[PDB]
Design a protein around this ligand. Structure first.
Ligand SMILES: Cc1cc2nc3c(=O)[nH]c(=O)nc-3n(C[C@H](O)[C@H](O)[C@H](O)COP(=O)(O)O)c2cc1C
Ligand SMILES: Cc1cc2nc3c(=O)[nH]c(=O)nc-3n(C[C@H](O)[C@H](O)[C@H](O)COP(=O)(O)O)c2cc1C
Ligand code: NA
Lengths: 199, 202
């Protein structure tokens, strides 16, 4: 593993992934385990739920995405979409799904009515924190990964397919696999416009 | 201490600390470099770079917590305010400094106008990138030997904060992170069973 800061700087968006893993599946699980154990949540509420799809379940997820898009995308746009999914995400080793348990969120809103407007946002925040931790650690072991949002289109089909609770709200999908091309250009705005220091 | 842990070790190390003091294991410039690294490399939707971070040290740190006290004075009566003041003074104000996390609403609005199809996603995505920055800074601050907590005295203080440091009106405050060298260790943390929270299917 790199240092925290090195691992963070290493993390990029990869679309050009393949269906190979440098680590055993149990170590991929242990990444997710580590994030879910230690990434913080408001009130220690532990609303985050992670589903790791590998092998044929990974392929099924991307089939669900394609089938969902077929319903809302005219034929030609679909054909381009299909080839792009098939040549990036669906070619990967696996996909991480991030959900937020709405029973927890609703429970906190009911139990702590003074903070009730804050819990949905705090739930989205802890989800994003888990997303960054997983993203970095997957790349640290040598995968490439991207962060996708084909929810809320797919959410009911995903919950149906893997028998997930109806109250798990899908946030993001993170396909990953060994990369075959390097990241491209990234623009950076000046740090001095975005950071102020006052003593 | 200054030498970094691995990503996983740094993440596991990170805990909430309320018992902090006004000392630093590192020079101020290295505190700034932690923020710099987070703001450079933490992702944002569309590479939109909506996060804005204000680091308060010294007298500015103390002023922030004085603003929080004064805000609470307005909504917390009498004897009970005395307890709140002592708790702020003994938990956040006694730290070395405070990180403030903002999101640039001109950036968000700009995205919503340029990409109307995605307009309802940008505010959520902005909150998400904010949280990613918050974790990165939290973890790195603790790795160098600080304790830190994550506070939400916004939206009570937000106008007073923007007034006091002359910050743009379109910077929306998300969270405040006081930090300092810790004087007590973290307490008990409950963990729900991981198999209720993680599923693996192949
Ligand atoms: C909240 C958020 C949402 C994003 N949504 C998408 C997405 O739906 N599709 C996608 O391909 N990339 C998405 N990205 C990736 C960003 O565009 C990307 O991280 C940014 O352009 C910086 O590139 P990097 O990841 O290589 O550092 C998202 C990133 C974040 C932080
Ligand atoms: C989104 C979010 C909001 C939080 N809000 C507060 C808060 O306002 N005040 C506070 O003292 N701690 C707050 N916390 C800290 C959590 O209660 C804490 O992270 C959780 O109990 C786990 O403890 P740990 O941070 O020691 O791992 C927050 C954390 C998160 C992730
Ligand atoms: Na360290």
């Amino acid at each position: 593993e790199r240092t925290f800061s090195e691992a963070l700087k290493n993390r990029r968006t990869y679309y050009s992934i393949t269906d190979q893993s440098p680590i055993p599946d149990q170590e991929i699980e242990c990444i997710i385990n580590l994030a879910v154990r230690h990434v913080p949540s408001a009130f220690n509420s532990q609303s985050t739920r992670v589903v790791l799809l590998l092998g044929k379940s990974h392929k099924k997820l991307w089939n669900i995405v394609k089938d969902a898009l077929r319903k809302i995308v005219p034929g030609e746009a679909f054909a381009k979409t299909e080839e792009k999914i098939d040549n990036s995400f669906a070619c990967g080793y696996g996909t991480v799904l991030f959900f937020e348990d709405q029973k927890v969120v609703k429970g906190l809103q009911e139990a702590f009515p003074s903070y009730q407007e804050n819990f949905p946002g705090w739930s989205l925040q802890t989800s994003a924190m888990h997303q960054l931790a997983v993203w970095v650690m997957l790349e640290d072991v040598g995968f490439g990964a991207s962060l996708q949002h084909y929810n809320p289109l797919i959410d009911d089909e995903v919950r149906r397919a893997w028998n997930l609770p109806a109250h798990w709200h899908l946030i993001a999908e993170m396909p990953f696999g060994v990369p075959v091309n390097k990241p491209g250009e990234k623009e950076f705005q000046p740090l001095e416009e975005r950071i102020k220091v006052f003593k």
